[PDB]
Amino acid sequence: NNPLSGLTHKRRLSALGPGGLSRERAGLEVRDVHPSHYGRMCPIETPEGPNIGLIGSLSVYARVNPFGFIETPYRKVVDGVVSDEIVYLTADEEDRHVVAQANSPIDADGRFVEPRVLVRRKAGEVEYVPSSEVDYMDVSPRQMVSVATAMIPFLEHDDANRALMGANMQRQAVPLVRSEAPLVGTGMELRAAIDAGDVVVAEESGVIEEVSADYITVMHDNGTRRTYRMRKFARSNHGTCANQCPIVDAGDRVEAGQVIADGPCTDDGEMALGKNLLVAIMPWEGHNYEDAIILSNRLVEEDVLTSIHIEEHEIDARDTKLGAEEITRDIPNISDEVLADLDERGIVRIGAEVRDGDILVGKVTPKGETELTPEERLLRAIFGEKAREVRDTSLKVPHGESGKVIGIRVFSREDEDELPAGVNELVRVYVAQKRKISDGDKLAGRHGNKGVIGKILPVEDMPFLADGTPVDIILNTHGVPRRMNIGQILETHLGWCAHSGWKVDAAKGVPDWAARLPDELLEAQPNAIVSTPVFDGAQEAELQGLLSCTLPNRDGDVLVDADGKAMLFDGRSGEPFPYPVTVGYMYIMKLHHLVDDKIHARSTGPYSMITQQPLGGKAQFGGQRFGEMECWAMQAYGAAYTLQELLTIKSDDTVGRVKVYEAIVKGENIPEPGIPESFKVLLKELQ
């Protein structure tokens, strides 16, 4: 789906598969979090469904030893003194030893501060232990987490349940038309994007010799030239848009290992899984009730939340017993208006537009010489038109699919293209969609605060700050303290400070709250980027104070307070809201659960080969399933006829459904249901 999605999939740890266990065989002991997993396997990252605890992510600092066990790095302490020397330890090896937590205060030389320190011991047991007995200490605070886990700002403020979804959903973020970096980060956004292999890294140093949208060429110091080719508009495995763009300009001095051109969801070589949005924490006329989300039309009119999706459509001309399938522009009983967007071959021309039901690849097959209808024979003598022996088997656009045709790939057995035995011409047609975000599209943040788009108001309807700036997104207050994911609030506060900028007061000295605050942050520009590393970063003290240092806008006016709130004007009534609303910026990811894919409906269509029931799946234009649990709901209501209908004329009554259709189109009354063909199958299966 996105670069991170792939990276995480390379670091999955599955207990399933041959040699392992089945899903049913797995008890409750296997799945939950074990004491040994620390620094080796992430405790957070794992699926929500029936696969929970059986699929895990490998921790950041971990590695695999030649014997197939998981080693993890630890800092070595000689005698109370931390040494930079690092040895990897296996699980059982760690047990025989005694490990200090990473955040334990350390002398500028390397010695401990307090004799008794926090200590990790075998069997997941913890106890204060004198410094003389400290063998090793953890490399980093963020040692126990995975890659996707470490991108969740203020993780230590969100409960594991919503933090879990937080990780799982980032892998579901969809590449937008162009990508912004997050205002609030953890620092992991950099290394993840590079290692993902879905950006472009320079092997050897030098100078950009020539740059184009197509490729970048670099002149090394030794004289050799290495050219990197840009992936431009390619379909992913999940129909997202892998598109790379050159960062550097021509004649830039580039050093080795530097990102010269990033790809999908990447800004300046950083994981860009979404946009920075102006949020407002308030219920709003019910339109955000039960996790629903309200959006500003700006997000549509400025393609902020717009993504590109590519599909791959295929068809082939085979050898039949009545001749051979030939792809052609000549299809029986079709006007030249429909065929208008075709070439001479029978293929759609690149750049043309396609709607559902339209024709992509005109293919015709010789139909079996069966005696045509004596009533259609009769109709062919009156109008004197002779029947063709070729039936329309063309490739038409699937329902719901649409967009511009952005490429054709023809393979011909004639052109020596090695095809499977029996195929003559094989066509591929790639259509891209520029899907603007809409109602029902699943949005999310990093804190497991999911939700679908309820309503998108016109830009003027939006609750706006004093200087007339309309907010972007209106989250519901109710659904926050229930989820224990108040990190999203922390991100928002830091989000506003990162947008407005700040400046601590140095007069009368460095304030006591900003005493642990590194020098580099005591002064911040508007729209600056920062890091809040997991189990480190911003503390609640520094955050409150930063809300006091929020720089005024272009009109010299401060917009939010030290509480973090501000006063909004209802864009509908005009009157200001009675109470201060919390306002700031939050990173929002467009998830790959869009209505355009999920929506589906069917009158009639295909049917099961044996049971004569409808087929199943949106890919098969199949019907829904009215299961055993739904049958009860019917019976409990006592709606016998409706229940009878659904399980008869709507399903597998061979003669029934046909006469239902006729009755409807004739405007008559619905006939009495017959015998389910499914039941007839049973009596034949019992015999």
Binding site: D84, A181, G187, G257, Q258, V259, L517, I529, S531, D536
Partner: peptide, 23 residues
């Protein structure tokens, strides 16, 4: 700074100094 290794944009980090080993 956080990761001052590749030639990356400067992201400032609230931190205790992390110099054990890069990811």
């Amino acid at each position: 700074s956080n990761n001052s290794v590749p030639g990356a944009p400067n992201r400032v980090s609230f931190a205790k100094l992390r110099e054990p080993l890069e990811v």
